[PDB]
Structures are given as C-alpha cells and as structure tokens.
Amino acid sequence: RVKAESAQASAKMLQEMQRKNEQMMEQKERSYQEHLKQLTEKMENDRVQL
C-alpha cells in the first residue's frame, strides 16, 4: 500500500514535470518563430528592408 501510494505520487510528479516541459517547449518555439519573422534570411522583415 505504501509502495503503491509512493508510485502513484511519483507518477503524478512525473506527469507534472512533463506538462511543465511541454509548456516550456511551446514557449521556446513561439519565441523562435517571432525571431525568424523579425530576422530570418528568406522570411524576415530586416532582409526585405535591406
């Protein structure tokens, strides 16, 4: 019972870390897309201006 409660707690903790990592990746990808829209050679504003 203690081992099952501990395994259930560890599984909950891992699921919480996975969600936090997914959120961080989505945030990082969003930041990269904005940086590309500002300053990527094919698809940017600064290159078009130059």
Q: From CA 39, how far away is CA 50, in angstroms rounded?
A: 11
Question: Residues with Cβ < 8 Å from 44, sequence gap 6 or more?
Answer: 36, 37, 38
Widest CA span of the chain, in angstroms? 68
Q: Go through the chain and tell me how many residues it has.
A: 50
Question: Residues with Cβ < 8 Å from 11, sequence gap 6 or more?
Answer: none
Buried b or exposed e, range 27-46, using 16+ CB within 10 angstroms: eeeeeeeeeeeeeeeeeeee
Listed resolution, Å? 26.8
- Runs of H (alpha helix) within 1-50: 2-39, 45-49
Q: 47 near 41, Cβ under 8 Å?
A: yes
- Which phi and psi (to 5°) does residue 25 adopt? -60, -45
